[PDB]
Amino acid sequence: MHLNPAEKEKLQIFLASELALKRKARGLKLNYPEAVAIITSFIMEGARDGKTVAMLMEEGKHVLTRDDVMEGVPEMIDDIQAEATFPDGTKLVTVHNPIS
Amino acid sequence: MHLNPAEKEKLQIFLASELALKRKARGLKLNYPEAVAIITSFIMEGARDGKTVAMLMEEGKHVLTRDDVMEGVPEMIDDIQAEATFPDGTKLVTVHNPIS
Amino acid sequence: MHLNPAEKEKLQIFLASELALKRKARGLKLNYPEAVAIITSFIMEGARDGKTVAMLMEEGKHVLTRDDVMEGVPEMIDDIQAEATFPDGTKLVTVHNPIS
Amino acid sequence: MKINRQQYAESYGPTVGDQVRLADTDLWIEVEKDYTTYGDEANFGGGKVLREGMGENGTYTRTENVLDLLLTNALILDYTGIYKADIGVKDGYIVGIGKGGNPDIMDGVTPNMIVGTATEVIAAEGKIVTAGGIDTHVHFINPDQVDVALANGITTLFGGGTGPAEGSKATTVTPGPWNIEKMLKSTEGLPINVGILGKGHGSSIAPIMEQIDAGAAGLKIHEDWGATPASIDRSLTVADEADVQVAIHSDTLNEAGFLEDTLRAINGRVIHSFHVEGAGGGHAPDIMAMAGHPNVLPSSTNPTRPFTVNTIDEHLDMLMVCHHLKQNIPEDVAFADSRIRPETIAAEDILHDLGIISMMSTDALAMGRAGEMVLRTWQTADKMKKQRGPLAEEKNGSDNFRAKRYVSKYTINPAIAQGIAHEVGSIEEGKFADLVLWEPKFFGVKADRVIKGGIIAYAQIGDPSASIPTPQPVMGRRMYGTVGDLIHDTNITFMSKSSIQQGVPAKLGLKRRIGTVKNCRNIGKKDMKWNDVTTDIDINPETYEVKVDGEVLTCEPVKELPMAQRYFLF
Amino acid sequence: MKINRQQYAESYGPTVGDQVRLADTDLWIEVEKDYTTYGDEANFGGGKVLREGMGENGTYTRTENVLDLLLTNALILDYTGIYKADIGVKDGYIVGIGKGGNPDIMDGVTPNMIVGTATEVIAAEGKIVTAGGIDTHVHFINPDQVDVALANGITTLFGGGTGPAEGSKATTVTPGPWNIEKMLKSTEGLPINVGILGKGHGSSIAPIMEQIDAGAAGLKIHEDWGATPASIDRSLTVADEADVQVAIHSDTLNEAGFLEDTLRAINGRVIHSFHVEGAGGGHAPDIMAMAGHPNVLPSSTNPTRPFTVNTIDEHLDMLMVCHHLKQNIPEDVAFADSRIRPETIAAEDILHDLGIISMMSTDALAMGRAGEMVLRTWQTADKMKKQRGPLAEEKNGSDNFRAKRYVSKYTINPAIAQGIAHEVGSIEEGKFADLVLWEPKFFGVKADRVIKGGIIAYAQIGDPSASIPTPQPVMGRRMYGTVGDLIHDTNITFMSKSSIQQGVPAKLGLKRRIGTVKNCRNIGKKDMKWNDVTTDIDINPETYEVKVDGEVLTCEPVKELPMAQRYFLF
Amino acid sequence: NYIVPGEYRVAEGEIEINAGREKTTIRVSNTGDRPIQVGSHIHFVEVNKELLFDRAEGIGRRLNIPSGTAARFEPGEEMEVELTELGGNREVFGISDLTNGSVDNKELILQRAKELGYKGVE
Ligand code: NI
Ligand code: NI
Ligand code: NI
Ligand code: NI
């Protein structure tokens, strides 16, 4: 596979997102790391899909809403940042205030 | 996400449980680590759901039965122990003789 | 569970395969590490199922075809090798030119 | 020109009179004073103040009052106060708390806090900064326990053990000269401060004392090795000669004596009573009465902290494993059961709140959680505010008195008890620069950056392959202070005066900083900061009801805690 | 007997006139010459040539012209040529490039390249071998960054920092004697070569110079510490006395001067201009004009490399984080915005292609990606071939001229700039054996094996529990060169001549090889291999249009790159 | 009742910066063709040569703006700014090397500024 250090680490994010999505699907209000994981994996999969950085900067604000998460979680997340390989190489996506 | 050492490790348990559940679903009798993983992840997800320690001590005996596992596996598992964050903080669940 | 070093590492392969299969299912042509992960996890799950080494040496050539992967990926993969616990212990499966 | 308070706090952190919520608790701390000069705040970055000729002095060499490190705009939470200041570090020690910058052009610069060519900057604006936690009940069982401790803000581990041997899995003991030497060598690779306890057992002095001469920093008396009147007596005789502390886990079984017999053997000498509530061990049911005595330095371990609806149910099997007991032996089960009492656990919450139990500790991996000492301290304080109300000592709606009482339990008090408070345990000038930065939203839960001897040792930080360090996954990671030979300069091995005098560090090739244990035989409960209360504690032998000043101490268990499911992935 | 070319290349790697595609780019390199004797190629394995009495000599002791290591059949890509040879290593250094084997029976054996009893073999047939990358813009922020660098073929890190402190997160600076000593000690555990930069700030000489005497290998002038005329001047005065290099990140704000004022302060002295395009910092908008001057050694950092459709959108928030800026301060945002210009980024691609920007670098973790210097160099070359065509200098349809121009940017040129090219930076006899093997399909993307001082330090290798090392999962892993005390012999700490003369290594107990920084005040743009062009660069202050020789330099951003989604799991 | 973890509850009132120090308002122009941005703590007389203002009025002073903020001058832009007095020892070293000592030495500072072409010396 030739996995580098980042590829190994970022597998964890995907896994944490899968965990969090199962928790959401069985009716739980998500906590801080769960919410961060879901939005982060969303961004990295979006890059893999070939979306632009600008698309993901905006889409990232519509992944989870405040009714999906526990009290105070929206205010705990000032931004989420993630890097992934886009068609044009690694780029950084910054999503400001992803959950209103 | 601010993952601490235990959060990172315990992701592995969830993953091993998912692996084992796929193996069970395609008709395989489960082995020792598979059985342990399933029961362990069950406990940690139960804590996340807000069950009590006492509930999980008993529910843990009804996750897998001897017909779900290979010969001798029930007798290899004297107990399973797992810690998770309950609504009232980290607690330990001990399940004695989880597979009769 | 008593996980040894290889059991821990090989969990990653299963996870990478699950990731890659989700990418394939949403319509993406797979890249090099994705393709390797899928074929590798296929082999290890086949061993768990109790297939022979000889069966998997041949089945491994029919997991992905060139229309499943990006340009040049078939030619990048000369072989895939994986070890797993068969009913008769650990064995090595070598699949030559898995994607024509 | 004036700045409104909201905007001021968002730029520089809070100032005098502002309050900050601790994590998701209902505890609020208020800034008591601020060492700054408004308009001359230090800050670093593009176009900021700490630049040559401006807030950074360009004239002075490192010796001329210049710092190695300035933490700008810290909100300090310490037994000494809750206040706003810059913190200046040099030679690995805190040298100034006050106002940093450049006396060329700024008013109110503390004279030895010059930002110069030699100065690194850490931005503490908007962070709470505390001393590193001092955990004095550590079982050295699994080296993976160190990162667990660092992640919750612990910087010193005192205890014993050789790994997952049954003796160590039960008791904080590194027994004898050879095991002690081996573990001192192991300690060279552990990125945390360490002190090692020998076995406080014997009926002759020499077998006990030779552990102190070998490099132990104290002793542990534990019932699993025989907490007999003789072992108690000999250990304290050794400790009084050697100037080290003795920790006791007393005779739960009451086999050779009741509590009063243990106290008679102690004979007024200084002792640290571990897990004084007794779930972690001790004369059943009345061990917690220890915490009333003037010669006792009392700590709790963490699984009983605080009293919750799941606390009792986890304990029996935990105890059975730790103490190598068998379910099929009725007297093993009876011993275990005798230690587990909701009556004393409930009273333990209140005794903490009253300043009668002075210290927290983990009991890491032997009925305790290595990364939850700090966590559970604040959960206890929060529970007590909810159930008891603000303390009478509070003012302006803040919880500052409670916050000082509770922070002392895991910082200064264990350091005083162990004879190491000249080096560690508080944010004071002249002490080692073991500092923990916390975002208030994560306070007591997950440390931001842990500084050890003036260099960051552990941090919550992201993708090492990214353009900046903030992208995911953000996780706890060891930093440069732990790498190569820097691990030697950023950590202290605490040892007895005799072992130091006898050249043990040179004999073993120890390269870590060597700290001297001292002044621990001439202290008592009166010396426990904000937790100095002596009183008669009565524990009913039949009902386990706990009384102080004729009043029954009891409270309810809670179903939910803060600093819990909002934060943790599992 | 004759062998057709396809079969020859499949057995021994390519020979004279054969071409190889670099990864999935449209760049082709052609073998220029071959040192072998056809029929006497060295190879190792079952029934192969390197056996006693045959291709391995059985007579000579290690001193008698015998190698410690032979890399057989390497395709070398270096500023010195693109050619086929065996590479011989002894005492951790490259001692022979030519033809290895046994002079008993083989023709054309290079006299000091005998394969003997003492010789290990690495098969390089079918691999491209390059010098290890020299990254001269490293922020030491997170130790996990080292493996990231090794995985993309970087073997030397020059820069500064103490971990995730704000000063270090913004600037390549290890400030003052104490922080420098601490980081030299930390470096003992980092499996890569290292040189440390002090703070190039002050208005007196002594505070700056004492960093050099403490062990710094150079200085960084950074606007976040005040890139004033005084700091520039004093730093260069120090550097001229000490024979070390100065890197500059200039005054973006134009606060104390415009570009011409910075150049006047430099006063014709040698300087390394970091991120010369200016997104990474410098006089807005015209900093890139630096790269026209004969006394400037100009580098780029990697996030602008090459110009793509997503480049601009990632930059603002990246910059805000790195330089500790606030979104709610309009002048912070204006400063950040002033640095981000598609006009100069587009011109930067072309300036690389013309040999006007001489070096690449990462800016690891402070607006740069630790593992993408090599990667983005080749993506830039590929983009320029696609948009500009083959260079006029090329012949036979190969891209050899471009390949030499571009490989020089991350190997020899940074080494020359830093004063370390006597030790590292190219595959030449007498230099340290830092070598990277690449499968052509992974060239510039993921290194196969990274050799440090003659021992493999990092490799893409599989299951450690398997019967052979090729089964999955194949991932980057540290090898034996990084383990125990071998990490000392396989890596170099580069230091100033004065610190070496003053015995700093002995004083700090440094066990690594100690490299001397020298000959960096007597060089200029003319000394940058294949990238030596001086010219007047005009940057329009209103439109940011870049002109060279009266011609506007511009190109389009691309939507896709090679060396991207075919290879990476995320 | 809604809990924002770690939230502030700031006190009432306002923070006066540089309290008790003399304030001076002056007009400043960017005569150059690239933007110039000036930080809160730079000795004002030592700013970029192409800023035009009464240089004598910048001696011993800096911008009266919150610590870490700045004033930005686009090309050709004139703005009115308020200065405050430097504190501490009222000495400046380095920067543009116009002072290197007490800010009281106005004649020397201006002589150096004029010789080097800093705009606005009488
Ligand atoms: Ni105990
Ligand atoms: Ni214990
Ligand atoms: Ni820079
Ligand atoms: Ni940089």
Swiss-Prot record, chains D, E:
Q: Which residues form the active site?
A: 323
Q: Describe which pathway this protein belongs to, using the record's wording.
A: Nitrogen metabolism; urea degradation; CO(2) and NH(3) from urea (urease route): step 1/1
User: InterPro entries from the entry?
Assistant: Amidohydro-rel, Metal-dep_hydrolase_composite, Metal_Hydrolase, Urease_alpha_N_dom, Urease_alpha_subunit, Urease_AS, Urease_asu, Urease_asu_c
Q: Name one GO cellular component term.
A: cytoplasm
Q: Which cofactor does it need?
A: Ni cation
PTM annotation = Carboxylation allows a single lysine to coordinate two nickel ions.
Activity regulation comment = Inhibited by fluoride.
Keyword check for Metal-binding, yes or no.
yes
For biological process, the GO terms are:
urea catabolic process
Q: Which residues bind Ni(2+) 2?
A: 220, 249, 275
Under the heading PROSITE patterns, the entry gives: UREASE_1 (PS01120), UREASE_2 (PS00145), UREASE_3 (PS51368)
Q: Which SUPFAM superfamilies match?
A: Composite domain of metallo-dependent hydrolases (SSF51338), Metallo-dependent hydrolases (SSF51556)
Its subcellular locations are: Cytoplasm
Q: Which residues bind Ni(2+) 1?
A: 137, 139, 220, 363
User: What reaction does this catalyse?
Assistant: urea + 2 H2O + H(+) = hydrogencarbonate + 2 NH4(+)
Where is this protein chiefly located? cytoplasm
Binding residues for substrate: 139, 170, 222, 249, 366
N6-carboxylysine is found on 220
What are the alphabetically sorted keywords of the record? Cytoplasm, Hydrolase, Metal-binding, Nickel
| The protein's Enzyme Commission number | 3.5.1.5
UniProt keyword Metal-binding, yes or no: yes
Q: How does it assemble?
A: Heterotrimer of UreA (gamma), UreB (beta) and UreC (alpha) subunits. Three heterotrimers associate to form the active enzyme.
PANTHER family the UniProt entry points to: UREASE (PTHR43440:SF1)
The entry's family comment says: Belongs to the metallo-dependent hydrolases superfamily. Urease alpha subunit family.
User: Protein name, please?
Assistant: Urease subunit alpha
Name the species this protein comes from: Sporosarcina pasteurii
Curated annotation (Swiss-Prot), chain F:
Q: In which pathway does it act?
A: Nitrogen metabolism; urea degradation; CO(2) and NH(3) from urea (urease route): step 1/1
Protein localization: Cytoplasm
Keyword Hydrolase in annotation? yes
Keywords (alphabetical) are:
Cytoplasm, Hydrolase
First-tier enzyme category under EC: hydrolase
Name the source's superkingdom: Bacteria
Alphabetically, the GO molecular function entries are: urease activity
Q: Which InterPro entries match?
A: Urease_beta-like, Urease_betasu_sf, Urease_subunit
Entry-linked CDD domains: Urease_beta
Q: What is an example of a Pfam family matching this protein?
A: Urease_beta
GO CC: one term?
Answer: urease complex
Any one Gene Ontology BP term: urea catabolic process
Q: What is its EC number?
A: 3.5.1.5
Q: What is its main location?
A: cytoplasm
User: Where is the chain membrane-spanning?
Assistant: none
Query: Is Cytoplasm tagged as a keyword?
Result: yes
Catalyses:
urea + 2 H2O + H(+) = hydrogencarbonate + 2 NH4(+)
Belongs to which family?
Belongs to the urease beta subunit family.
Question: How does this protein assemble?
Answer: Heterotrimer of UreA (gamma), UreB (beta) and UreC (alpha) subunits. Three heterotrimers associate to form the active enzyme.
Protein name per the record: Urease subunit beta
- Species this chain originates from: Sporosarcina pasteurii
Gene this protein is translated from = ureB
